[PDB]
Design a protein around this ligand. Structure first.
Ligand SMILES: Nc1ncnc2c1ncn2[C@@H]1O[C@H](COP(=O)(O)O)[C@@H](O)[C@H]1O
Ligand SMILES: Nc1ncnc2c1ncn2[C@@H]1O[C@H](COP(=O)(O)O)[C@@H](O)[C@H]1O
Lengths: 570, 575
């Protein structure tokens, strides 16, 4: 309980330091691995364990006459390391300030470096940590590695959320309407909200499903009277929707009808607005007009059309270019539904469509099996005891302690399945996936990696030189990336977001494996380069040793910023 | 170096904390197992590891407004626990964690307030001892941490930290100029012993089973002596002191005695400093050392030299006729004893001459036991240069694998039985009071399985008034008998302190590191063992009954007795 608060404060803190080190200290030059010239105020027990130093001293100089001390377990160029001491600060004698005080000062430091302040961020960092405390407390009695035993529990078990983010669990629910009833981390379940709507205003996109079968995937249609159909949305989305005067106007005129929470019974997933239904053919991905992680997460009209277009393309690449796809497994997105009143104003129509918009994703579990499939973020995350959960999950599958050569063999299998499809798609066809931890699902046979399923069509882009060569101009704009923009994304998602976290969780207690795992990534890049059918200059530079693009989560909140570069592990 | 220093500050702090818990806090009721009501100043990392609390909160109210906080691994009646955090202090005021010197200063001041007396000399002795430890850890810090457990001399030499419940374990007050490294077993010191040539007519020789001449050659080669003279030998620092005296100078000028410098056997001091080991020699040499080491002056008193003879005669008789009543005792013999004084000196001068020159021979048990099968207990249960209990690695090696709970309980059981039976057998059956603390004990083991617990040191053997004193022939100097004579209760306090607080408590804390739930199981095995031994005693034991039924055990002090003008306290029973 106090324990739960204490667990949450260390987790949040570690998230905030990842950002400081990655976004600011490494790019700008503020980090050195050295001991302070004067340790006054730091207790012996923070850096001395009885026999030796607890790892390596880390110092961060900060323009404002501010210093930061922390012990770490490794040197890493991507800023991935286990922190082995509390954080200490000096302006003067060293201090160990409380959570909030520490956040306040560190954020302040980042605001000077940035030249801008953010009124809202501070309260978001604290909100996020107070949820995590509620979460740890609620979930603290289960076996620690239980999230990795079933697909759904892994969506529900990203306790700490994104691991390089200042406010991972920021969720700004409306005037009451609840928290815990909608949180995956609380095993949230609910009947989806339903409306009955005239068919003249429906928009349906579909691939190999009839417009009727697309509706059937969202709602049982039988209660619809003729000339009508049933749409569903997040109960929170439905209450905000029934708060516009344009929806009240329509409900009073009996153009649309409210059917309450009468829909399929579903569990939301780590993305909050995508719902899972055990043994149904589809996940449901709706719009939620709510600030999740600082951002309204919505299905814009042209994205509803993106999705269809993308789905059809992956199907066409598979049927004809399977062997230049590098072993690709992806969840399809076969249908898309929205509603707007007939002969509505262009602006009204945008807003109705965006509010009611929904996508169907293939429930890959029917195909992969729900007890073989783990969201990649939960796989490489830490349990309620703050240990990386991967460690014991391998232990019970392997049948004993894993030696160095079993971690390297396992890693090799894993990273091969991530890199081969991603890099095949970008250089052979100009398709840009987004393989961060939360768009990837490992499929595994008794623990041995089989495939890494990739999802999320919102995140798929097409390059102007290649991909786009496979419709409305605004949809086109949404889909299009330059070859450079796209390569930055693939650099960040694959190496910094994903495998950097993979190697860290596998290499706990054994930091010497880290460069061994990096050399092996470098050797896998080479073998895949020779397997490509098109020019790959960008991959040559990465293989050479050139800097790697990295997306930012703190910095983008301070400036009026987007990406930095970090030196390459090889 | 900086790492070595920190290892020593941690080690010394822990020893001093032991004293405070054992001699003030627990007996006077200043101790509670309880979180502060306010944590400000203490960092999260000091009590929280990421998942759970690093053990149990320990807290001490010190009458002078001062309070103390330290995380410990267990609750213990004797003050035996592993400390799992730095030490924190607060007045009236946030918590803080002072450096070693201030931390020692404020702890000292608090114990002094209780006592009403200050001892700044003990303060300097605390700092001085920590510094020698700093040097010791740095000199030895590269050998394998359990190397001191592989050979007998090594075991005498690798008591890196000394007495673990003492505020100044390594403090040794030689004249400032004679150095520390040259005489320290922790620096693998060796030396030729210092010799004088002396006329035979002032020798006072005690021998059991040996001729006078064999006793002499036990200390030195008598070959360089001229007719009617012998060669006695001596700690070279003691010869420095012995030669200060005007009486000695006067013999030197008159050529009655000659100074032969350091020309005797090269030998290696052992943990008691004044007792030398020679590899493959029949005997240890135990000399006087008129220097303050730890809590006493290490002279063989003139009357202790007479009594050694009688206790050795006595032990031989017991071991020979009364075997069945001795509980399996193994004890190092002390068969010869030499000293010199001028034949025409009076009592006072003769007594003083005899204490400067006093020598005791003790049997090199390693001739029976084997050098590689023998370990001083003190070290056996001590921390290596890494601050880990050396017995852990010692046992895992000899057992091939990691020892499970049972394995440790079994090993403990074979150990305490062989320590307890002899000691209690000697005290109840015969009234012979031994002093079985960690340094008066050697474990004879076979591939790590404990075989004998040999016991040593006749200087502190006493005989009870009701029983033990019966063994001595009533034509003995009154002073020699006064020295041997304990009351039954004086006798019982000592044994209780040595057996259970000094010894097994340490055995148990070492064996049971990282597994504190074995301590009560182990104290229970101890208790069943007392009941067993009792039904085997030939005489009554109303004190053993009191102990079994959970009455408080007697505890010797090492800080309190240094502050008082009080030598003992009572601690509550483990069971
Ligand atoms: N390692 C991760 N990388 C990216 N997003 C993550 C990660 N872990 C959790 N998430 C969350 O998953 C959601 C993805 O949202 P989006 O990418 O906008 O569809 C965001 O709320 C993220 O905060
Ligand atoms: N645990 C211990 N108990 C008693 N003496 C010890 C202990 N550890 C080290 N020693 C040293 O062993 C020597 C024995 O002294 P004595 O009591 O005269 O035999 C003293 O110098 C002590 O400092």
């Amino acid at each position: 309980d106090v324990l739960s608060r204490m667990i949450s404060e260390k987790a949040a803190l570690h998230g905030l330091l990842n950002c400081l080190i990655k976004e600011f200290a490494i790019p700008e030059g503020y980090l050195r691995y050295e001991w302070p010239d004067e340790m006054k105020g730091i207790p012996p027990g923070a850096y001395f364990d009885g026999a030796d130093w607890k790892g390596i001293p880390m110092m961060i100089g900060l323009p404002d006459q501010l210093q930061l001390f922390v012990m770490v377990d490794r040197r890493d160029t991507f800023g991935s390391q286990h922190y082995l001491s509390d954080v200490y600060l000096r302006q003067g004698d060293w201090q160990c300030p409380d959570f909030e005080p520490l956040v306040a000062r560190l954020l302040a430091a980042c605001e000077h470096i940035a030249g801008r302040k953010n009124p809202e961020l501070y309260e978001q960092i604290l909100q996020s940590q107070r949820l995590v405390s509620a979460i740890v407390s609620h979930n603290g009695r289960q076996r620690a590695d239980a999230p990795l035993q079933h697909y759904l529990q892994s969506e529900q078990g990203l306790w700490f959320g994104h691991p390089s983010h200042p406010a991972p669990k920021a969720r700004l629910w409306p005037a009451h309407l609840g928290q815990e009833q909608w949180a995956p981390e609380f095993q949230a379940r609910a009947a989806l909200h339903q409306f009955e709507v005239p068919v003249d205003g429906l928009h349906i996109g579909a691939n190999g499903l009839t417009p009727q079968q697309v509706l059937d995937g969202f709602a049982d249609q039988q209660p619809a009277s003729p000339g009508h159909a049933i749409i569903c949305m997040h109960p929170v989305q439905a209450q905000l929707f029934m708060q516009d005067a344009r929806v009240q106007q329509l409900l009073r005129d009996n153009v649309i009808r409210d059917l309450g929470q009468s829909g399929r019974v579903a569990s939301p997933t780590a993305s909050i607005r995508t719902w899972f239904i055990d043994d149904h053919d589809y996940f449901i991905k709706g719009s939620l007009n709510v600030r999740i992680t600082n951002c309204v997460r919505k299905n814009a009209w042209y994205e509803l059309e993106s999705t269809v277009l993308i789905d059809r393309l992956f199907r066409q690449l598979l049927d004809q270019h399977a062997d230049t796809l590098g072993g690709l497994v992806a969840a399809a997105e076969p249908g898309v539904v929205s509603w707007s009143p007939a002969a509505a104003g262009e602006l009204d129509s945008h807003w109705f469509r965006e509010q009611t918009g929904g996508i169907l994703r293939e429930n890959f579990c029917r195909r992969t099996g729900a007890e073989r499939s783990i969201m990649a973020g939960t796989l490489f995350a830490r349990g309620v005891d703050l240990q990386p959960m991967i460690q014991t999950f391998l232990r019970t599958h392997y049948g004993e302690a894993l030696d160095d050569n079993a971690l390297l063999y396992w890693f090799d299998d894993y990273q091969t399945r991530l890199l081969r499809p991603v890099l095949s798609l970008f250089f052979n066809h100009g398709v840009v996936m987004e393989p961060h931890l939360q768009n990837s699902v490992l499929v595994h046979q008794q623990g041995r990696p089989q495939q890494v399923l990739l999802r999320d069509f919102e995140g798929v882009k097409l390059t102007d030189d290649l991909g786009i060569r496979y419709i409305h101009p605004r949809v086109r704009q949404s889909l299009l990336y330059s070859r450079e923009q796209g390569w930055n994304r693939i650099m960040y998602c694959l190496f910094i977001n994903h495998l950097s976290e993979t190697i860290l969780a596998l290499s706990q207690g054994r930091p010497q494996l880290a460069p061994l795992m990096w050399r092996r990534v470098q050797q896998q890049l080479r073998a895949i380069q020779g397997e490509l059918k098109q020019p790959s200059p960008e991959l040559d530079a990465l293989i050479a040793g050139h800097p790697v693009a990295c997306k930012t989560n703190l910095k983008v909140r301070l400036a009026a910023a987007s990406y930095v570069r970090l030196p390459s592990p090889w």
